[PDB]
Amino acid sequence: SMSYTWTGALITPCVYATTSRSASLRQKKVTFDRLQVLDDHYRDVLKEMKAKASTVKAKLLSVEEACKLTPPHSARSKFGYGAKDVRNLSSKAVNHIRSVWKDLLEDTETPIDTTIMAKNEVFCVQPEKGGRKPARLIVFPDLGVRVCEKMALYDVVSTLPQAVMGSSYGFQYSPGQRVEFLVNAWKAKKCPMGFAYDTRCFDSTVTENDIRVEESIYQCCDLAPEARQAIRSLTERLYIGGPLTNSKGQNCGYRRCRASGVLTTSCGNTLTCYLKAAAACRAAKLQDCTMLVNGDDLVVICESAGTQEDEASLRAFTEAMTRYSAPPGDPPKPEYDLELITSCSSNVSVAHDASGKRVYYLTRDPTTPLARAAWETARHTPVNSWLGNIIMYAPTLWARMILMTHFFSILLAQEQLEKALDCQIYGACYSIEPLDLPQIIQRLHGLSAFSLHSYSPGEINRVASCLRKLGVPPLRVWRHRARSVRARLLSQGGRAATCGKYLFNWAVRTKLKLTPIPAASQLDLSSWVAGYSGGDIYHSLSRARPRWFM
């Protein structure tokens, strides 16, 4: 069937940023009929997956438990109540949720309406690479449905993917753990080879059968009968597809593929992609495959059988994936250095800590993080990629020298260090206090993140070239600026001084010996686990039992 059908009704809205005018170009790309042929390899992997799912027990979340997970800036309900009312357990919201739930338990076929919108993403615009890129589409049900999804499937999506995929489940890793997995995977092979597999419009390639296969995996859990019916009804009425409505309330068409704004988007895409990829590994007869699946993103580390054999295996892998209804965007390239694989726009690099020891870390081209940050300083935005980039890429030269320096000088100038901000980062929305960045960074990357030096020439040159291209002052200017920022932060004591000490040690002539932050142990990061991209999940950072002297 067709991934989408359109009535022709325009997608209405509620460093450059893509608008809902360029959404028409995206519609042509994402619209196509799907051809899917399955085999024994696919059925075998599926059964092995289902067998692992069988070990899972999932709790049914209460109205309140589910309400408390709602982001405060989550799109308001067309039934006149919003994220705040939900979070506050307002009788109108709670009563409207209890009815949506009842309807899911009682109505098994009626499609649920979804809202289609364009996601305004800030970019740079490379004139050498060609032209502009279209805006991505966000398909999501009403607030009431969204709370019900959490009641039925939050515990499923939090525990099932790791039970099924184990170490292959990307979303379970902090950036430091992800790198540890990749490096060990690489080191474990006699002669390693690796590649990234990028599917052309993954959500669109997802068939209504793919969606039932994943409900079949969810159905292996020990579920409460209401959770079972909710999963069943949500599959038929929402996940397999339904009608598309713009912000103006007009019908835009109909969908028969993955909805990007549902709780099961990351989880379902991970399971689906893993299933197809593990099946394709067998079809292409790759030896000793290690997979890292992160939503629609895939990295395979296998055993090299020689340049010509490896190229042959990859073509076979692609042919299998295509049959499974997962054709590639760009055909995969085999790589013989781990640092050469690019996935989730990232690559593994190496540096030294304070004692000369090697430390691996994730990095990426800084152009987009810098442009988005340049836009975010220019105009107030409710979701800051800059803070997600600091947290995600804390060990990188560019996050430390440019992002940290620039934004702490602004927070200093606005006496807003204490003010919690909402940060994006791939999936879920996080409420983070900039003053907590050192503990966060220590927890996610290690104390070494504050002592990294001896960066590779390639990384240094990438960062420097990028600054020149974007009209950003050079690294020597940033070192100067970070010395004032540091000085002013130190003079403020407490967490602010820790920000100056730890985050800006790189800027001082004679380096300070940095001890582990004591308060880093008391931060609760238990929730940080799974990917909830479109999942509408809110996690505000908390600390159990704070020691007074902190």
**What is the binding site for ligand 8XM (CB under 6 A)?**
170, 174-175, 178, 182, 292, 294, 297-299, 338, 341, 343-344, 346-348, 362, 391-392, 425-427, 444, 528-529, 531
Taking the complex as a whole, the smallest distance from the CB of residue 72 to ligand 8XM amounts, in Å, to 18
Among ligand 23E, ligand 8XM, none, the one that 134 touches (CB under a kind-dependent 5 to 8 A) is: none
| β-strand pairing of 192-197 with 122-123 | unpaired
Taking the complex as a whole, the smallest distance from the CB of residue 315 to ligand 23E amounts, in Å, to 39
Separation of alpha carbons 460 and 449, rounded Å: 17
**Strand, coil or helix: 43:** helix
Do 256 and 32 form a contact (C-beta atoms < 8 A)? Answer: no
| β-strand pairing of 114-119 with 242-245 | parallel
Which token pair is 161? 């993917």
Taking the complex as a whole, the smallest distance from the CB of residue 382 to ligand 23E amounts, in Å, to 17
Taking the complex as a whole, the smallest distance from the CB of residue 481 to ligand 23E amounts, in Å, to 8
Taking the complex as a whole, the smallest distance from the CB of residue 32 to ligand 23E amounts, in Å, to 35
Among ligand 8XM, ligand 23E, none, the one that 211 touches (CB under a kind-dependent 5 to 8 A) is: none
Separation of alpha carbons 291 and 301, rounded Å: 6
Separation of alpha carbons 408 and 16, rounded Å: 24
DSSP 403: I
Burial of 91 (C-beta count, 10 Å sphere; 0-12/13-18/19+): exposed
Do 194 and 335 form a contact (C-beta atoms < 8 A)? Answer: yes
Among ligand 8XM, ligand 23E, none, the one that 399 touches (CB under a kind-dependent 5 to 8 A) is: none
The closest alpha carbon to 499, from 413, 439, 425, belongs to 439
The annotation status of 155 as a binding-site residue, yes or no, is no
Taking the complex as a whole, the smallest distance from the CB of residue 120 to ligand 23E amounts, in Å, to 17
Between 220 and 404, whose beta carbon lies closer to ligand 8XM?
Answer: 404
Between 505 and 533, whose beta carbon lies closer to ligand 8XM?
Answer: 533
Between 374 and 550, whose beta carbon lies closer to ligand 23E?
Answer: 374
Between 185 and 370, whose beta carbon lies closer to ligand 23E?
Answer: 370
Separation of alpha carbons 277 and 282, rounded Å: 9
Among ligand 8XM, ligand 23E, none, the one that 161 touches (CB under a kind-dependent 5 to 8 A) is: none
Among ligand 23E, ligand 8XM, none, the one that 281 touches (CB under a kind-dependent 5 to 8 A) is: none
Among ligand 8XM, ligand 23E, none, the one that 392 touches (CB under a kind-dependent 5 to 8 A) is: ligand 8XM
Separation of alpha carbons 215 and 260, rounded Å: 17
The neighbour count for residue 389, using CB atoms within 10 Å, is 24
Please give the torsion angle defined by the CA atoms of residues 529, 58, 264 and 51, in that order, rounded to the nearest 10 degrees. Answer: 90
Separation of alpha carbons 239 and 258, rounded Å: 7
Taking the complex as a whole, the smallest distance from the CB of residue 64 to ligand 8XM amounts, in Å, to 24
The closest alpha carbon to 63, from 96, 15, 26, 24, belongs to 96
Among ligand 8XM, ligand 23E, none, the one that 377 touches (CB under a kind-dependent 5 to 8 A) is: ligand 23E
Between 366 and 531, whose beta carbon lies closer to ligand 23E?
Answer: 366
Orientation of helix 225-234 relative to helix 143-165, angle to 10°: 100
Between 156 and 373, whose beta carbon lies closer to ligand 23E?
Answer: 373
The closest alpha carbon to 302, from 268, 335, 269, belongs to 335
DSSP 330: S
Among ligand 8XM, ligand 23E, none, the one that 457 touches (CB under a kind-dependent 5 to 8 A) is: none
Between 67 and 399, whose beta carbon lies closer to ligand 23E?
Answer: 399
Do 488 and 503 form a contact (C-beta atoms < 8 A)? Answer: no
Q: Which residues bind ligand 23E (CB under 6 A)?
A: 15, 370-371, 373-374, 377, 402-403, 406, 470-474, 477
The annotation status of 524 as a binding-site residue, yes or no, is no
Please give the torsion angle defined by the CA atoms of residues 440, 441, 442 and 445, in that order, rounded to the nearest 10 degrees. Answer: 130
Exposure letters 39-73 (e unless 16+ CB within 10 A, then b): eebbeebbeebeebbeebebbbbebeebbebbbee
Between 300 and 467, whose beta carbon lies closer to ligand 8XM?
Answer: 300
Among ligand 8XM, ligand 23E, none, the one that 370 touches (CB under a kind-dependent 5 to 8 A) is: ligand 23E
Taking the complex as a whole, the smallest distance from the CB of residue 148 to ligand 8XM amounts, in Å, to 25
Taking the complex as a whole, the smallest distance from the CB of residue 385 to ligand 23E amounts, in Å, to 10
Please report the DSSP string for 49-74 in residue order.
Answer: HHHHHTT-B-PPPPHHHHHTTS-TTS
Between 86 and 292, whose beta carbon lies closer to ligand 8XM?
Answer: 292
Annotated binding residues: 198, 296-297
Q: Per the annotation, where are the binding residues for Mg(2+)?
A: 198, 296-297
